Amino acid sequence: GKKKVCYYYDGDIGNYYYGQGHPMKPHRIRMTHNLLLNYGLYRKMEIYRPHKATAEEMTKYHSDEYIKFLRSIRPDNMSEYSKQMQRFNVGEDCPVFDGLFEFCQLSTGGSVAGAVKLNRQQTDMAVNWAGGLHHAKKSEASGFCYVNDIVLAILELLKYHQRVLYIDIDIHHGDGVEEAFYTTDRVMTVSFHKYGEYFPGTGDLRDIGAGKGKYYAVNFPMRDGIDDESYGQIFKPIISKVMEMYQPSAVVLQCGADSLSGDRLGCFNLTVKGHAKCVEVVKTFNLPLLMLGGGGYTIRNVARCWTYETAVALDCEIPNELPYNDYFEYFGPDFKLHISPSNMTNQNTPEYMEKIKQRLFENLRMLP
Ligand SMILES: CCC(O)(O)CCCCC[C@H](NC(=O)C1CN(C)C1)c1[nH]c(-c2ccccc2)nc1C(N)=O
Ligand SMILES: [Ca+2]
Ligand SMILES: [Ca+2]
Ligand SMILES: [Zn+2]
């Protein structure tokens, strides 16, 4: 039935600024929080302020030199780190900004704290909209991500769970998470993403893992314009087959909202209901679940999406009419929660969707 939900948020998160022209806006996390507060969703959740994850907690995955660099670099001393900046991929996508390290500490803190709460059996679901930064690598920042809070949260879950399932519905391939666990069968990574002339360039349907991890990485490559009908047609069947074969004891779901229609960087056509149907599908399996954020660059739609997904986690129905809130004007001209899909062509034909699903089903038959 209805589950206990723990939500992680730090009121300072919205003040971190990647810089003029950068599409990543931490302010969208504050818009989400304010909208969900004005809908009354705080009365049903346990709200926690995450601790600032230590450099030591981060080195459970990342290299000591990379974390030392992140903790040392600032806009005022950047000139002395031009060598390490190239080495760790700090530049246009992953710039040096005021409070960069503290932003990583809060993003990571929420994910690891949520994983600890799930491990202690003190909650059914844990939510950290500031997390989900799936591109960060062991010793390299990538695609607006510096510390891989997801990998750290999964390593925490692995202390009490033999098998953990990771599902990623961001429009971009979950490469950092897939790479971290590519050679192990203790984590199965499943990513649905746009593939073809698109960042990060990985996630081919033929990338299925290696060594003991062979068949434990699943990639569903998609073309522009996928809609609710098409996404829904493959998501539940694939996740059901993965649950059946893999039998995970905990799940981590990255809810990147850049897969929504009208995203500034994305080219998909999902509505908030279509995106949230993924949360409903996963929630139905009644397993300990960590829900994380990720991409999302049309910030009014990211706030709508994550507010609705928090309501889904709580089994709470909320009206389409938006309540008054601190950012009300951002939701014009309609001031409604739900969004309409665009007229863009769906390049993912029904036959293509079925064919890719059948190839993934063949790989899933190879599990023990
Ligand atoms: C948080 C998780 C997430 O998956 O959502 C992150 C998405 C990251 C997208 C990064 C992308 N970067 C690239 O395409 C650059 C081109 N190569 C040098 C790499 C990129 N960078 C930028 C960018 C634009 C303006 C200023 C800075 C970066 N746009 C894009 C783009 N349209 O794909
Ligand atoms: Ca993905
Ligand atoms: Ca794996
Ligand atoms: Zn993305």
125, 283 contact by CB (below 8 A)? yes
Which letter, b or e, does each residue of 204-215 get, where b requires 16 or more Cβ atoms within 10 Å of its Cβ?
Answer: eeebbbeeebeb
- Structure determination method: X-ray
Using a 10 angstrom Cβ sphere, with 0-12 exposed, 13-18 middle and 19 or more buried, the burial of residue 116 is middle
Q: Give backbone dihedrals phi and psi of 137, rounded to 5 degrees, phi first.
A: -105, 170
- Can you tell me the distance from the alpha carbon of 271 to that of 286, in angstroms, rounded to the nearest whole number? 25
- Can you tell me the distance from the alpha carbon of 283 to that of 288, in angstroms, rounded to the nearest whole number? 9
Q: Is 87 left (phi over 0), alpha (psi -120 to 50) or beta?
A: alpha
**What is the resolution in angstroms?**
1.5
In the chain, domain spans: 1-368
134, 294 contact by CB (below 8 A)? yes
Nearest CA to ligand 1 atom 6: 143
Residue 363's closest CA among 228, 232, 220, 231?
220
What torsion, rounded to 10 degrees, do the Cα atoms 353, 361, 237, 254 define?
Answer: -80
> How would DSSP label each residue in 300-340?
HHHHHHHHHHHHHHHT----SBPPP-TTGGGGTTT-BSS--
Residue 330's closest CA among 24, 32, 8?
32
CA atoms within 13 A on the CB side of 14: 13
Give the Å distance between the CA of 189 and the centre of ligand 3: 6
Q: Give backbone dihedrals phi and psi of 119, rounded to 5 degrees, phi first.
A: -60, -40
Give me the sign of the Cα torsion angle 325, 127, 289, 1.
negative
Nearest CA to ligand 1 atom 31: 265
| C-alpha triplet 131, 136, 142: angle, nearest 5° | 115
Residue 105's closest CA among 26, 51, 154, 68?
51
Tell me, what amino acid is at 341? P
Q: Which two tokens stand for residue 246?
A: 């893999």
- Can you tell me the distance from the alpha carbon of 146 to that of 90, in angstroms, rounded to the nearest whole number? 9
Q: Tell me whether residue 27 is one of the annotated catalytic residues.
A: no
Q: Is 89 left (phi over 0), alpha (psi -120 to 50) or beta?
A: left
Q: Which two tokens stand for residue 339?
A: 């969004």
Q: Is 364 helix (H, G, I), strand (E, B) or coil?
A: helix
- Can you tell me the distance from the alpha carbon of 307 to that of 291, in angstroms, rounded to the nearest whole number? 12
298, 25 contact by CB (below 8 A)? no
Residue ranges for the known binding site are 21, 25, 168, 170, 172, 181, 184, 187, 191-192, 216, 258, 264
229, 202 contact by CB (below 8 A)? no
Secondary structure letter of residue 51 according to DSSP: P
